[PDB]
Write a protein that binds this ligand. Structure first.
Ligand SMILES: Cc1ncc(C[n+]2csc(CCOP(=O)(O)OP(=O)(O)O)c2C)c(N)n1
Ligand SMILES: Cc1ncc(C[n+]2csc(CCOP(=O)(O)OP(=O)(O)O)c2C)c(N)n1
Ligand SMILES: Cc1ncc(C[n+]2csc(CCOP(=O)(O)OP(=O)(O)O)c2C)c(N)n1
Ligand SMILES: [Mg+2]
Ligand SMILES: [Mg+2]
Ligand SMILES: [Mg+2]
Lengths: 559, 558, 547
């Protein structure tokens, strides 16, 4: 009864039921059957394992776990660890290491200085030295992972120590996992919140800009109730979509720096020009809604609310900075504004009409479909297949992703799922795996571009094996299209050797992996393929040829 | 004319004609057409890009370059960087970073502390700060990369500075070292004479030769030394082919897994009578460990390396000669010019056991056995290659150690695998690099389903570049190496940690534009290999296999 | 028989006979009497311990050792470590750490992440994990310390493991001289340097201390004498030619034009057309800008390291090899060359001599050039030919030592060129006197620097090291006042000015006899008393600089 047993058992104490990963020769020390109620989920690549854990942790609000072997195992995991540190999720990342007496980084076969590599991109990073201490290392890893900004904690596990029973006996202390993320709280935040209330009192057109930290705090119902009483519009980051339902009159949509260029419309101005008070609730620069994006039209006052001290005063200097738990802020603000009546909200109907126009685009194009037409089709079928307030649309990374930000249906928090902080291509499949395991009876659709999807396409077999009924739409233009855009923004022309691929038949690719698939080249075929996939009881993949036809000049907000 | 131009131009000065990578939004600052003579090679994943650079650098003996975007680009590239630091290749690894004024690691979108992440696994790691200095940073990167132990140097490139012309005017000589700079101890010549004196007394010496001997340019000189004094040559995985196939002093490669695979006391046969082991160009990372040769009688040891011994806890040679390998061999020639040839010891029982595995004529109900697959590969490689030419590449897994024992190598680096780092998925990028380095030679890859599928998407890259690689995927629907270790440790398996569902690799290959076929016996496999070798296009062959391993014969792994 | 025994025992195998340091609560695990032939040398501060070891390693050319307790012991040691890494000396630095099971940096009492703190300023840094491995950890430390650029290796020692015998029941092979790097084709680069030399009318050899570590002083001297090539040195390589030798063109410093009221640097370098930097190291602070005077020069870099600073120094010919090996191949390649006409620096020489002989009496105090003249006179009297050490602490006065101090042997003049920590004086004199027990050892220090580390006067008295110290006092961090004036054209006293310290009474409080000297006559007599006293002695001299 070894450190391997004590490790899995302590993970189970913190509520962990799955370990995502790829196991190496450390399997001599750990099988993964040692503890009832915790199972191993084998992936094709360690990135997929880390991102699956990240997303399961985001949707559940609880710590999750991923696993890799020594050396290149750990370095592959590290992109998943980077996803978690920048996207903010409490992940316990575990990696094997060389036998303790044989740790000579860059000399022993497969031996890297794992702690030194992973420490700069994690909340906590340690190597096991005495087998019985694994219990307390796991606890400290959870403690640091579950403190804002939430993130991954790493434990390196020399194979000899992982397989040792030295000092291990028969009743663990309580796990004491934080109920929700620990935050920091400045003395005098209540006063700062009252100053925010006094700004709201004077303001003609305030807005709430809501990031994911608001969701982790459990502040969604409270924020909605506050907004509905005071008639304050709710604008969001990418993953804060769905904090209000689709169709809510205060659902002013999400922001992306790409939106003016994609829509050939003054969308940022429409969204922010008349606003005189911006309250960034649970603000986090990593999400990439930046101050320059709301600095439109008239001069604005700002209120930052966050469970962290401002890490970026060079960029964001709020007029009022409220460092506290988001829910505690909202509850205090309700009391302070109880007597306040409702504002006249500003008018964004021209932007709404432009968005609706893209979604309804009836044209047929000689090349393939347009991405907005694809997402409108996905929206229609997700609305049919999901219960109200349920379902998940997942997006990999690419130019198409920002169409997702604008156009994708989200009818609950994290109803639209993508990587905002880290944005690694290939994110789509592991995110859909995590989303579907987190919401076992909800429809899970994934949209991915050809570039990113193929960077991590091999985990189609994992989807097949776990029989996760994800429907995947691959929008294919034989290009890293986002990068072709940036070539043109910077140089006013392309260079194909850096962005162009030859042909990949993703339908056939999927089928090689045991996932049924089909090609769709217009709305009618796409709606049929989506409806079939949604009802199939099995994974399904749809390849859709697309093109973009972008205006390189329309993207100045990206600087 | 920006720092992007000065960067590429300076790589060109050091002989670089290709940059492997995946480009991100730093494409706004760099196109990759700024310098004639340097082409970008786009891959599907950054790992492939790093490994291809690593292998190209190994075979050419010249610095090569790879490229990633910020954040997850860099971390993806980092497994390729780890490949180069542990396998020892001079790679200049380049990655974009957030705009200089906006670098807030873990707060700014996609911004990680790249230098801090990469420093521990590199020879040199720096962030560009003033555009015109990129020239001297590339120089410092090459310098550190080409000092033993050779390895990757890393430069982080803020997007704004990469695109800036500030301080750049319109170059000093490159001075690229033709071979790695080495460490040399005072008194190494005296240590080399003590080695000569041990050789005089020894009855059955061997030369155990690592890759560092190849880098030094010492292959012909070791061969002439060994032939004169009748000293057997035993190699690490990638020093296979320092002697030709069939050479009588070619005593084969070592792997820790050889006794278990052969079900034979192979290490004992190789080493028991030996009284003097000279480890020429020794490197522990290659995983030919002292415990492997410490069989039978007590032996004296001579370490020769262009580095100070980093592992005295494990290896305390009786004589340690810290110098360049070729310089050692030329002095040692002089010191031993008058010695009589040795009576070399017998390993024929081991040779016969290996030949017997290669000639295994059984048909199994399962699929094929891996030793039969490699036998078929050797046969066809010998037909298609000029003498002294051809490359067989191996990915990582249980089958890889069969490659070590069984795969044909008729030149230095004629059998390529990752000895130090051993990341699965290595095969495709290594075959790409090998084929670009030897454009007119046959390049064959063998990979297992586990590792092949970990990085199978760069099949599209092979098609796009039209590199006529022939790939054999040996498929048992398992991370078999790992099931073996489950059985060594626990005396049973646990499927959820090692088992996959079915993948059709033939169809997978064809989805990427690579022709392919299934082969289930020697006849079908020989025909598929001959078709692939004459095709003038890439080709893939899937072969069902099984292993049926004996966990009790792998004690040497501990 | 514990890991403490095994640690001391392995230091002993590598030739170490002294451990300089300050012991903390780890005394429970190590006494320092476990192994015969190793003595502990207790200092008042850890800095003094580190630097003493650095200097003893420099002179002996063998690895030396220093010791501190955990936490702030280790951080105090780190300035000594920094000295060793920038000045280049093979030092094994050892510090205790919290018990292994209680290592929680920044939470456990006195626990810092020692390895993370010291790794960036060392050749090697590790924490002991298994008691019996201390033997191999010491070997790897020595190995890394004795590879160019030579430097400190650090081992962190959790006190429970240090005092444990678990697992504790091979030749040391200590390198006799530093291991270095050698580039393929260096012989060919050396021949290109030979061809540059044939074409050159006025070559010079700029010699750094790495040339001394290679054992190349006699060979460089013979080369220089045969081809009539002047030799200029760094701060640390004064004495590679004897005092008086016609090719001993001296050391340079950036302040030498200012000190002499003379275009000294232009006189030294203006007509030179080939500079061979023999054993070059940027850390010795002879930068390319110092020789880039007058005509364009070709340059030859010779060093057993690959060039770390191509941004600053791009030699025309870069010879990466052992310095002695370069010199022997260069002898062969230049065997039949005619000797050069060497360029005239006699006006500079005559100026310097006029400076040193300055007979004026000043109202304020003495001038530092007069203090060094006096020290030179008495050193030449008290020392055998080719012997004696003058040590200099850091400050404005230090540049006077570089320019004018007598050095009749390699390391005959000591100072910190790389790190240049004030307080370096006392420890460097301790190390020098222990390295040369029968040779006279003089120290010159300024009031700012000397007082930063003056408590180790008690160590000098306890060890009865007959060091003669001269403290030049102007109640100021004078160099810093100079920098205020260079940048702002005025002083700001709160950042540079001290009140009075009576260094005579300070020395005597520490059990060191002392006296004040206010002119040449009093200083000569005081120096002669100190030199013959057979005990340490200190002399305070009032000085002023007046810029
Ligand atoms: C790991 C990683 N490397 C590189 C990038 C730069 N990048 C972002 S998305 C992307 C893929 C873009 O292509 P695609 O998935 O086809 O979407 P498209 O832009 O064509 O719409 C790339 C290469 C990245 N995001 N992540
Ligand atoms: C990046 C990485 N993760 C995990 C491992 C552990 N490992 C080594 S080889 C390998 C693949 C084994 O399966 P396969 O390629 O099918 O060969 P087999 O052992 O079945 O013969 C794995 C998972 C690894 N080598 N590299
Ligand atoms: C540890 C350290 N802190 C600060 C300095 C800056 N500094 C260099 S020398 C020096 C002392 C100058 O005063 P003094 O020793 O009296 O010599 P002076 O310059 O007056 O001639 C100081 C403060 C330093 N060298 N080292
Ligand atoms: Mg695309
Ligand atoms: Mg397999
Ligand atoms: Mg002073």
């Amino acid at each position: 009864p070894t450190a391997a047993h004590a490790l899995l058992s302590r993970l189970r104490d913190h509520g962990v039921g799955k370990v995502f990963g790829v196991v190496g020769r450390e399997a001599a020390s750990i099988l993964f059957d040692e503890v009832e109620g915790i199972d191993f989920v084998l992936t094709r690549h360690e990135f997929t394992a880390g991102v699956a854990a990240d997303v399961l942790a985001r949707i559940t609000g609880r710590p999750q776990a991923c696993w890799a072997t020594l050396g290149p195992g750990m370095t592959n995991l590290s992109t998943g660890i980077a996803t978690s540190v920048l996207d903010r999720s409490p992940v316990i990342a575990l990696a094997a290491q060389s036998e303790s007496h044989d740790i000579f980084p860059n000399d022993t076969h497969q031996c890297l200085d794992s702690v030194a590599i992973v420490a700069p991109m994690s909340k906590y990073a340690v190597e096991l030295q005495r087998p019985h201490e694994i219990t307390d290392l796991v606890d400290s890893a959870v403690n640091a992972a579950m403190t804002e900004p939430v993130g991954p904690s790493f434990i390196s596990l020399p194979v000899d120590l992982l397989g040792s029973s030295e000092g291990i006996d028969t009743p663990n202390p309580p796990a004491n996992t934080p109920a929700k993320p620990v935050g920091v709280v400045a003395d005098g935040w209540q006063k700062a919140a009252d100053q925010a209330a006094a700004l709201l009192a004077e303001a003609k057109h305030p807005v709430l800009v809501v990031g994911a930290a608001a969701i982790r705090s459990g502040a969604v119902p409270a924020i909605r109730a506050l907004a509905e009483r005071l008639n304050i519009p709710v604008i969001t980051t990418y993953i804060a979509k769905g904090v209000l339902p689709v169709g809510h009159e205060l659902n002013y949509g999400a922001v992306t720096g790409y939106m003016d260029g994609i829509l050939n419309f003054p969308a940022l101005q429409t969204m922010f020009a008349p606003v005189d008070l911006v309250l960034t609730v649970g603000y986090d620069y990593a999400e990439d809604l930046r101050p320059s994006m709301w600095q439109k039209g008239i001069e604005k006052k700002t209120v930052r609310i966050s469970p962290t001290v401002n890490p970026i005063p060079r960029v964001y200097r709020p007029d009022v900075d409220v460092v506290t738990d988001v829910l505690a802020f909202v509850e205090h603000f309700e009391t302070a504004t109880a007597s306040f009546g409702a504002k006249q909200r500003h008018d964004i109907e021209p932007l709404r009409a432009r968005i609706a126009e893209f979604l309804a685009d009836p044209e047929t194009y000689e090349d393939g479909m347009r991405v907005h037409q694809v997402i409108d089709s996905m929206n229609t079928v997700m609305e049919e297949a999901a219960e109200p307030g349920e379902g998940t649309i997942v997006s990999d990374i690419g130019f198409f992703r920002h169409y997702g930000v604008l156009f994708a249906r989200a009818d609950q928090p994290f109803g639209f799922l993508t990587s905002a902080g880290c944005s690694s291509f290939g994110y789509g499949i592991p995110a859909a795996i995590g989303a579907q395991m987190a919401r076992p009876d909800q429809p899970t659709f994934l949209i991915a571009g050809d570039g990113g999807f193929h960077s991590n396409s091999s985990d189609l077999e994992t989807i097949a094996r776990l029989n996760l009924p994800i429907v995947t739409v691959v929008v294919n233009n034989d290009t890293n299209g986002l990068i072709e855009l940036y070539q043109n923004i910077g140089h006013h022309r392309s260079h194909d050797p850096a962005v162009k691929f030859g042909g990949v038949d993703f339908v056939a690719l999927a089928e090689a992996n045991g996932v049924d698939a089909t090609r769709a080249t217009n709305r009618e075929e796409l709606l049929a393929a989506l409806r079939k996939g949604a009802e199939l009881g099995r994974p399904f993949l749809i390849e859709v040829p697309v093109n973009y036809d972008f205006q390189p000049g329309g993207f100045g907000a990206l600087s």
